[PDB]
Design a protein around this ligand. Structure first.
Ligand SMILES: O=C1O[C@H](CO)[C@H](O)[C@H](O)[C@H]1O
Ligand SMILES: O=C1O[C@H](CO)[C@H](O)[C@H](O)[C@H]1O
Ligand SMILES: [Mg+2]
Ligand SMILES: [Mg+2]
Ligand SMILES: [Mg+2]
Ligand SMILES: [Mg+2]
Ligand SMILES: [Mg+2]
Ligand code: NA
Ligand code: NA
Ligand code: NA
Ligand code: NA
Ligand code: NA
Ligand code: NA
Lengths: 1011, 204, 193
């Protein structure tokens, strides 16, 4: 029958979808959500054998264990155990596009388990098996007898095993197919794996059972009154003595309870549902649920007889909240939301796509700690525990159907075909039937990148009909089709339009006011965080805050999809597309997270945290104005700390408790501060500290901060005259300067400071030269597909122009002796194919104090692509343990991504001055730096810099971080100017004009001296 | 043009149509109809079927047609004749002046139906003036109303021809049979004959 | 697999639906809507045999005409030929309401046709068969090989027979089931045939 090559057959003998069940036979256990003796886990060690195709599977496998099989842990993806390679491809399908057919060589995983089943489970009731996640299709056998079939790798497939089991030992046989017609709806840009990767368990339900229940909460205008409505469905024989009681609990207090026999109201000419009943409970002054304060109640649904005999009980957490779009705004409990979200795949570097509670909790804590209040389930229903945690910790969730057909041409070829409507409908309907009771889910998504087809409109309407409590959204076909209540573009820019034909990405500010448009706009994806990214992030938030209908978005994305591999020594290293022999592959494009695979933050995380702060500030005179962006809570766990420092040196500080109501403001008058003595710039730095611990953070947690330049006193004091006068030694080949035991050597041939001595120890391994290039960032490379060679990308334009090939040609090199110093004047031209790209003119002034004043004036030909940077670089002969600097920090920060950094005195070990991006590139830069200290060296001025054991050349030529080797000495890059890193997307030039070095003529000065 | 979907015998009527497990089977009866007949100028209105109550599957298929073929209005009578699955109020046997306030699915008099708060759609009875036997009394009342009220745009009489079958007696002469004459049981007897003309097309 | 008791399976190997085709190889004929040589009718005399259930159908029938069968005209409702009785019920289903199951005693009509096909049709192109109406479900065989399945009594079911036909004589075998899960969607107030 080859059911795995037929979109008409998405399952066989599969039970109906429903909300989480546990079949408690005790109500208190249901109330407290404790383990149920009726819900057994079958996770653990299973038997496993791998086959090249389903036709290679021996019939004997159905009757008994294959000796050739191994014992492995379940859940798991078999690629993670080494049976075959995991494949990383973005758009292009991992298989030949020929729906509904899949390759004849179809990796087949045969799972089997021998287990016991208590006789008590078979003497009465129904025993079913539950597979929470099987990728991508499978056949089931119990004791050699065929049971059923199932598709959709992201939702549970349940089967009745009542007639298949026997008291004692039993054996299951599961044939998991890697590829199936379902694979055509699962073309998400992620690793392609397979197997039983989610839980497997047995559930025993009585014959007369609760087969489904829906919980709805409606409110009056001011939310002071609520009605909890619970519809309950049952299966089995209807009896007049049967009853359903629904009780609502607030902690250990019972708030309300209602009982009633079965039999619903009249529906149509034929009657009503005799097997259903709806309980309505009144609730006064309900504690409302929100991401801010996740208030929760517990609803227990008991099925019982009139004489008080419990048959079974189910239950769920209930969050009282209303979600609705009104007059163009997405409102929660009547307040307009501002979505600080992020897309999040279920990925683990060792276990692949298998999710565990610990990793989930770790992600949520890190998310809330970094000011995120929402998550999009890109691009499929998640492990059932995710929703429970988001309900309890408080995060708004966009639950998304497992449907992506990106590799089709056009994208909507399948979604506009009615023959695929059935398969698509199940991926949407079974998601809703499963997650509809979770308060954390506030929006339904029809899928991702499947263009826009008629099948979308049908399913959109289906949701709106069965569940009017949640808005529905979908980005395909232009982000504003008739299948979405929300304009949800991906990578649409703030001010710049991208007028693509048919599916244009208008700037978000413009999109809102297009003739006739009235819907709110929330980007489903934005600020692509691939590698050194998030440049321009602050631009989005300034817009989100200014425009009511711009209600945020979800950053792409949370965690790098890198996998752990081990070298000969057994040392682990991070791998990406193509490191498993997988091909075609899209290499490093699977890594776009704010955090590394092991959850260590990327520098970009701090920028997001800062921009997504819930408190805003304005300074006026001595008054700090604090505005709360919380919609429901007062600042009852916040105190503001302020600090004033003169160039890093603390002068005054203090703290005032914060007491601002949601959306309110507070004025904090700073005490009179004694004006500083010495010259310099005074800086005010405020930060919000939460004194008390919470479910998501520790005491002392910093949730927000901001800085302001205060008074500055320019230095007018003339330095005391020097004691000695530097001496100039002119030779045919050099210009050497002597002063004490210090020496400076300038090569008259190259025209660069080739060497500098302190005593007799050389300070440089490589001369000090200009540098106008950088090891390309993921954004500079600009490709989402390894097969695309984009000429328009920055790196390609830089190479073509010869920036990476340019060579300095000495135009001038003279030396003069001044009354108290030596002046070396030079001029260089950088050319490529007879074209002068850059002209750099410098002057070096070394005086009696041993300080070398370097002035650099650069010319950049207007018709050459704007350079990555304008500065100098050299390889210092020495290596120190610390790096001290007065500037923006402490973390890596670039021109278009430095709002989170603070000007102050920072001191870190050399290693922290290097960011371990899996795919090496320019990194570790720090801007607004006025002083840099390293070893015995000190550089002063107004520059940007990075310092590490890796030259731009090595980073540029090494594809993986684990292959980098520390070079002798220390590489120093000091830039007068540096181009933005961009990030609006990573497959087209994204550096905003204001951050491009297009001025033509640049000037910067650096003083180099001994410390 | 009407999809082959009628689940009248269910309790309640929408038991299958509000069940997503039956959405596939239902979608094929609607989608394959549209793909076959969309080029015929005679077809001016699509129908989602008959007497299947009103379920979510109806709303889904209703929108599917509106999306693939905007040139024709879509109508459906199940669930009250005025649900979100129909562009036309299309009751069956709703009377001209007399209301029939059935619970949940009332059949208002057609003149009153048009003006209910918020109602704006045209009204065309998908079925009316049941011509079973000596019938059609009051027919003229409908037409006086159709002519006076702009939004009352007619209807479809039920129905065209008796569903009687030919049987033969001892002499071998033909006679007109109805429910139960073939030993079929249970059966609803003469209720299959509601036409304006006899089975042989002779006028009533 | 009892495909007639599974609303999840409404057809097997059925071609996409589409507007009326005639495949003219002459435009003038297409303009005047004249008969097309590429569209052959298979209406006429067929071989038919009635069975109380699909389980009673002998395997021999798949590759050889049953001698007990009669020659009947098609299209036709078998109740009209007297094989069993037509049923008239208004609202109440003629079968026990227990979706998606139907009675085990499911009147089965076995149709077969021996017909010719010219090599010119098989040497090039696609040859498909079209059933404009089959009540209410059926399995199709061609020269003893299973071809497909179909439901919905009021729309055409088309199947590609290009790989099952041969030059010369060919034999179709169609097993039509009176009841199927599709019957649950066909409870119109009319005779049940
Ligand atoms: O548009 C997109 O951009 C991302 C690029 O990393 C990723 O492929 C998402 O799944 C896709 O929706
Ligand atoms: O409401 C109806 O009335 C008629 C009674 O003869 C017939 O049963 C139609 O099919 C049905 O829609
Ligand atoms: Mg399939
Ligand atoms: Mg994609
Ligand atoms: Mg700032
Ligand atoms: Mg079927
Ligand atoms: Mg009826
Ligand atoms: Na806004
Ligand atoms: Na990606
Ligand atoms: Na406080
Ligand atoms: Na690199
Ligand atoms: Na009128
Ligand atoms: Na009738």
């Amino acid at each position: 029958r080859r059911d795995w090559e037929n979109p008409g057959v998405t399952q066989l003998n599969r039970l109906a979808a429903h909300p989480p069940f546990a079949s408690w036979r005790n109500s208190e256990e249901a109330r407290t959500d404790r383990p149920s003796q009726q819900l057994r886990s079958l996770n653990g060690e299973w038997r496993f054998a791998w086959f090249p195709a389903p036709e290679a599977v021996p019939e004997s496998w159905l009757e008994c264990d294959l000796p050739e099989a191994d014992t492995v842990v379940v859940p798991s993806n078999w690629q993670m155990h080494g049976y075959d390679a995991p494949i990383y491809t973005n758009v292009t399908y991992p298989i030949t596009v020929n729906p509904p057919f899949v390759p004849t060589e179809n990796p087949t995983g045969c799972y089997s388990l021998t287990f016991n089943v208590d006789e008590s489970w078979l003497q009465e009731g129904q025993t079913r098996i539950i597979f929470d996640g099987v990728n991508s299709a499978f056949h089931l056998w119990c004791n050699g007898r065929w049971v059923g079939y199932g598709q959709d790798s992201r939702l549970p497939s349940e089967f009745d095993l009542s007639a298949f089991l026997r008291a004692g030992e039993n054996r299951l046989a599961v044939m998991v197919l890697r590829w199936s017609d379902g694979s055509y709806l699962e073309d998400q840009d992620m690793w392609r794996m397979s197997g039983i990767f989610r839980d497997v368990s047995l559930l025993h339900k009585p014959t007369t059972q609760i087969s489904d229940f829906h919980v709805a909460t409606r409110f009056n205008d001011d939310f002071s009154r609520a009605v909890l409505e619970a519809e309950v469905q049952m299966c089995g024989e209807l009896r007049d003595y049967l009853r359903v009681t629904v009780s609502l609990w607030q902690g250990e207090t019972q708030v309300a309870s209602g009982t009633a026999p079965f039999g619903g109201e009249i529906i149509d000419e034929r009657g009503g549902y005799a097997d259903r009943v709806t309980l309505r409970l009144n609730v006064e002054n309900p504690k409302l649920w929100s991401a801010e304060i996740p208030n929760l109640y517990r609803a227990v649904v008991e099925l019982h007889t009139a004489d008080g005999t419990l048959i079974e009980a189910e239950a769920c957490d209930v969050g009282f909240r209303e979600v609705r779009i009104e007059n163009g705004l997405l409102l929660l409990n009547g307040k307009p939301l501002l979505i600080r979200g992020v897309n999040r795949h279920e990925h683990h570097p060792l276990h692949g796509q298998v999710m565990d509670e610990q990793t989930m909790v770790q992600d949520i804590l890190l998310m809330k700690q970094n000011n995120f209040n929402a998550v999009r389930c890109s691009h499929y229903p998640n492990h059932p525990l995710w929703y429970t945690l988001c309900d309890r910790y408080g995060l708004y969730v966009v639950d998304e159907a497992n449907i992506e057909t990106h590799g089709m041409v056009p994208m909507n070829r399948l979604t506009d075909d009615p023959r695929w409507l059935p398969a698509m409908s199940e991926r949407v309907t079974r998601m809703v039937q499963r997650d509809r009771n979770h308060p954390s889910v506030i929006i339904w998504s029809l899928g991702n990148e499947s263009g826009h087809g008629a099948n979308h409109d049908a399913l959109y309407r289906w949701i709106k009909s069965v569940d009017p409590s949640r808005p529905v959204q979908y980005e395909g076909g232009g982000a504003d089709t008739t299948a979405t209540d929300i304009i949800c573009p991906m990578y649409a820019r703030v001010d710049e339009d991208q007028p693509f034909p048919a599916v244009p990405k208008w700037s978000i500010k413009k999109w809102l006011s297009l003739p006739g448009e009235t819907r709110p706009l929330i980007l489903c994806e934005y600020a692509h965080a691939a590698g050194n990214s998030l440049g321009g992030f602050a631009k989005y938030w300034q817009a989100f805050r200014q425009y009511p209908r711009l209600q945020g978005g979800f950053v792409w994305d949370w965690v790098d999809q890198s996998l752990i591999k081990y070298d000969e020594n057994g040392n682990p290293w991070s791998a990406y597309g193509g490191d498993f022999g997988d091909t075609p592959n899209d290499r490093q494009f699977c890594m776009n997270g704010l955090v590394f695979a092991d959850r260590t933050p990327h520098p970009a995380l701090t920028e997001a945290k800062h921009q997504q702060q819930f408190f805003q500030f304005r300074l006026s005179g001595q008054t700090i104005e604090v505005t709360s962006e919380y919609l429901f809570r007062h600042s009852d766990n916040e105190l503001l700390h302020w600090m004033v420092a003169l160039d890093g040196k603390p002068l005054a500080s203090g703290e005032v408790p914060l007491d601002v109501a949601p959306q309110g403001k507070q004025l904090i008058e700073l005490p009179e501060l004694p004006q500083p003595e010495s010259a310099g710039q005074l800086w005010l730095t405020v930060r919000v500290v939460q004194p008390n611990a919470t479910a998501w953070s520790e005491a002392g947690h910093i949730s927000a901060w901001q800085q302001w330049r205060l008074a500055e006193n320019l230095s007018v004091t003339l330095p005391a005259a020097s004691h000695a006068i530097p001496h100039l030694t002119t030779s045919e080949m050099d210009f050497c300067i002597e002063l004490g035991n210090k020496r400076w050597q300038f090569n008259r041939q190259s025209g660069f400071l080739s060497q500098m001595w302190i005593g007799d120890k050389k300070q440089l391994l490589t001369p000090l030269r200009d540098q106008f290039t950088r090891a390309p960032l993921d954004n500079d490379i600009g490709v989402s597909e390894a097969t695309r060679i984009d000429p328009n990308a920055w790196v390609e334009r830089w190479k073509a122009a010869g920036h990476y090939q340019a060579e300095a040609a000495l135009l001038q090199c003279t030396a003069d002796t001044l009354a108290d110093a030596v002046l070396i004047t030079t001029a260089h031209a950088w050319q490529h194919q007879g074209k002068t790209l850059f002209i750099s003119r410098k002057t070096y002034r070394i005086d009696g104090s041993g300080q070398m004043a370097i002035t650099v004036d650069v010319e950049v030909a207007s018709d050459t692509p704007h350079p990555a940077r304008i500065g100098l670089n050299c390889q210092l002969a020495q290596v120190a343990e610390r790096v001290n600097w007065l500037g923006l920090g402490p973390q890596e920060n670039y021109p278009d991504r430095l709002t989170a950094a603070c000007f102050d005195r920072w001191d870190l070990p050399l290693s922290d001055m290097y960011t371990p991006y899996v795919f090496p590139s320019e990194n570790g830069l720090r801007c607004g730096t006025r002083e840099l200290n390293y070893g015995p060296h000190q550089w002063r001025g107004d520059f940007q810099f990075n310092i590490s054991r890796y030259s731009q050349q090595q980073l540029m030529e090494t594809s993986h971080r684990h292959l980098l080797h520390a070079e002798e000495g220390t590489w120093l890059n000091i830039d007068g100017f540096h181009m933005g890193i961009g990030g609006d997307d990573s497959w087209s030039p994204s550096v905003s004009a204001e951050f491009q070095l297009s001025a033509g003529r640049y000037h910067y000065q650096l003083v180099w001296c001994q410390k």
